[PDB]
Amino acid sequence: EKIINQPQDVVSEMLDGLTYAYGDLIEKVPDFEIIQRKSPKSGKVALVSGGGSGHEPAHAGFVGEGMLSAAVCGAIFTSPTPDQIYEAIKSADEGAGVLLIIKNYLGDVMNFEMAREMAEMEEIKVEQIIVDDDIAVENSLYTQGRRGVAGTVLVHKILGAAAHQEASLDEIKDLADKVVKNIKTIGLALSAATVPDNEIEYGVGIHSEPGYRREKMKTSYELATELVGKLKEEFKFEAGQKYGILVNGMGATPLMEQFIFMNDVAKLLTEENIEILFKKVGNYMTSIDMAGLSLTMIKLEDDQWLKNLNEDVKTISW
Amino acid sequence: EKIINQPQDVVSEMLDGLTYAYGDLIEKVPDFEIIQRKSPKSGKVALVSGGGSGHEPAHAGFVGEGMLSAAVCGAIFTSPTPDQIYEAIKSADEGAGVLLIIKNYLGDVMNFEMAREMAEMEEIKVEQIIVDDDIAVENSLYTQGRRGVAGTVLVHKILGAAAHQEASLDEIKDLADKVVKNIKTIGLALSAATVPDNEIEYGVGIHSEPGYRREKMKTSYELATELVGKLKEEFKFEAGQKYGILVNGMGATPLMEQFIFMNDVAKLLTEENIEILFKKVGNYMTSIDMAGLSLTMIKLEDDQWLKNLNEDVKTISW
Numbered sequence: 001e002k003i004i005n006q007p008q009d010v011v012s013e014m015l016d017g018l019t020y021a022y023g024d025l026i027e028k029v030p031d032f033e034i035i036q037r038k039s040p041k042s043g044k045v046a047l048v049s050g051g052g053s054g055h056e057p058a059h060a061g062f063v064g065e066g067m068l069s070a071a072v073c074g075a076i077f078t079s080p081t082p083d084q085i086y087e088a089i090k091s092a093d094e095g096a097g098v099l100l101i102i103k104n105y106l107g108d109v110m111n112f113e114m115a116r117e118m119a120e121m122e123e124i125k126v127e128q129i130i131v132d133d134d135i136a137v138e139n140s141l142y143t144q145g146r147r148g149v150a151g152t153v154l155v156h157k158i159l160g161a162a163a164h165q166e167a168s169l170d171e172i173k174d175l176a177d178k179v180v181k182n183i184k185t186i187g188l189a190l191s192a193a194t195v196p197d198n199e200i201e202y203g204v205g206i207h208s209e210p211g212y213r214r215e216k217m218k219t220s221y222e223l224a225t226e227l228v229g230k231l232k233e234e235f236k237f238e239a240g241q242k243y244g245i246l247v248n249g250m251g252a253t254p255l256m257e258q259f260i261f262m263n264d265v266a267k268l269l270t271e272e273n274i275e276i277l278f279k280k281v282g283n284y285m286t287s288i289d290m291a292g293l294s295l296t297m298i299k300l301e302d303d304q305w306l307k308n309l310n311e312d313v314k315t316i317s318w
Numbered sequence: 319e320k321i322i323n324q325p326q327d328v329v330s331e332m333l334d335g336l337t338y339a340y341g342d343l344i345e346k347v348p349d350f351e352i353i354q355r356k357s358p359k360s361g362k363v364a365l366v367s368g369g370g371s372g373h374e375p376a377h378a379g380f381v382g383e384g385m386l387s388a389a390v391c392g393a394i395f396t397s398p399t400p401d402q403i404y405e406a407i408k409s410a411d412e413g414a415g416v417l418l419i420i421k422n423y424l425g426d427v428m429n430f431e432m433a434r435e436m437a438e439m440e441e442i443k444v445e446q447i448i449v450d451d452d453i454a455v456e457n458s459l460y461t462q463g464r465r466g467v468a469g470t471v472l473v474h475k476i477l478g479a480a481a482h483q484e485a486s487l488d489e490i491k492d493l494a495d496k497v498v499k500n501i502k503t504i505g506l507a508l509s510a511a512t513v514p515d516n517e518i519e520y521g522v523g524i525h526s527e528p529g530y531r532r533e534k535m536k537t538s539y540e541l542a543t544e545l546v547g548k549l550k551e552e553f554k555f556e557a558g559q560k561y562g563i564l565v566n567g568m569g570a571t572p573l574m575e576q577f578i579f580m581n582d583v584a585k586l587l588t589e590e591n592i593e594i595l596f597k598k599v600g601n602y603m604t605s606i607d608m609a610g611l612s613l614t615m616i617k618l619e620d621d622q623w624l625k626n627l628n629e630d631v632k633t634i635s636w
């Protein structure tokens with residue numbers, strides 16, 4: 001099944017593999033599972049994110065100039081602890097403050113917010129944005145509202161650019177609020193992640209949370225029909241509207257299948273006469289070895305957002 | 319070293335052993351590590367506490383009529399998760415509301431407070447009290463302020479009685495605030511807990527947190543001199559004052575040694591001409607197999623507190 005060593009070492013061994021390979025990030029003093037960018041501090045707002053391990057490249061792979069300052073990596077499918085996050089906050093600060101980018105899950109939000117409080121007692125200026133883009137099915141388990149998924153990666157990029165453009169904590173906070181409201185995602189799974197039949201489930205969570213509907217095998221086009229259909233209901237498509245699109249694989253789905261799926265999406269959208277100005281395909285927020293994918297659309301209600309999506313970055317995975 | 323089975327099963331196997339032995343408590347639907355009293359609900363304020371496992375009998379042993387409604391047991395030395403606690407809140411409520419008794423540690427407080435919020439969204443009335451009785455040494459690791467230790471057990475008993483006497487959530491909240499401020503504790507360790515030399519450490523934490531001073535072996539009387547000395551500085555002893563006393567063993571310290579220590583404490587206190595109206599010795603909040611003990615004093619600034627300490631209860635460990 002897995003290429004690993006001792007199951008309780010996977011996070012540390014991975015991060016050591018990561019830093020060995022890409023000296024361009026660093027692991028904070030070999031006592032913390034935090035990956036920080038080597039890019040010299042220069043009074044930019046610092047962006048900090050993270051969550052459970054098992055979603056690679058999510059977070060650590062988006063640490064670099066133009067995106068995240070640091071990523072705090074928890075245990076597999078488990079939020080980082082507030083001390084880890086607190087350490088990342090105070091180590092990432094450049095003098096302009098820190099924005100927390102938090103995926104909407106009970107644990108992640110609890111932890112990051114506590115870390116925030118800790119960091120504020122040390123007089124660090126910190127704001128937060130909670131990403132709740134998953135429109136699958138409301139209050140999954142104990143997630144309060146919508147789960148935060150692949151769309152988070154776009155939030156990193158868009159805010160990443162703004163921070164790199166010397167915007168203030170306040171401005172970036174205001175932008176995050178507008179941006180997150182215009183990002184919607186829905187995914188599906190052909191299989192569940194394995195943590196160290198002929199059926200599919202719509203709306204599966206990235207931690208292998210249950211979805212809203214189980215179905216016997218459907219074709220790519222049929223699956224695409226379901227997902228675009230849901231996103232169409234959410235955004236209420238009108239001709240002339242501008243969107244970006246991200247097709248994101250869950251880990252064990254070949255690129256071939258993601259592009260076949262992209263093709264189907266394209267077909268389903270031509271009817272809508274909307275303008276797709278940004279397209280992206282690949283494994284950006286996975287779920288270990290889950291077979292499946294998700295479809296993310298961002299309504300481009302501001303020319304700056306596209307410019308930011310296309311802004312220069314130097315990360316491992318972008 | 320240990321009598322256990324699979325290290326990851328210790329909490330569940332223990333709780334199953336507990337319920338088998340003492341049907342008088344129950345484990346909530348075999349999906350939660352919550353121990354609730356079988357005592358029939360009757361519109362009393364419900365008391366809920368908990369924390370990491372490894373401090374037995376702490377919490378589960380004090381679940382019964384006259385004390386706690388339920389205890390939420392986490393992994394070893396680890397706070398329970400907010401969902402577990404949330405489930406205990408809504409299952410313990412009798413219609414009069416729920417008071418959370420939380421030991422002051424970063425994790426416990428984070429978790430219980432989140433659980434509180436969850437429970438309040440379901441319109442459950444909940445108050446909280448954070449116990450910070452450990453005067454050892456301030457902001458240990460990330461504990462914000464003083465750690466919550468053995469004195470918590472007294473808080474259970476005193477509030478336990480009040481709730482049993484049909485006091486309202488508000489009144490009980492007000493009492494907790496006054497009570498916790500008058501409870502102070504300091505302990506020491508001859509050895510650290512082992513989780514599944516000739517030196518002692520003063521102010522060791524119940525999770526094997528570091529203390530304030532390490533010392534080569536001292537006699538019982540010398541150790542007692544240190545502890546009473548610290549508590550004397552805290553309370554500022556004056557003749558005529560009334561106190562209760564709890565000598566609490568850490569798990570691997572024989573009762574013989576706890577009584578020899580009690581004897582030394584008595585001697586050191588006779589000079590103070592204070593009135594000791596309540597005395598108690600034994601293993602009430604342990605730390606696995608730690609050799610050591612702690613000394614807890616409660617200033618009895620209200621005749622009701624003593625009456626409550628002596629009030630009837632039906633728990634496993636009191």
Ligand SMILES: O=C(CO)CO
Pocket residue numbers: 050051052053054055076077078079103105107108207
């Ligand atoms: O891995 C999950 C998302 O971070 C934990 O909630």
Ligand SMILES: O=C(CO)CO
Pocket residue numbers: 368369370371372373394395396397421423425426525
């Ligand atoms: O076991 C410890 C006290 O509950 C965890 O903080």
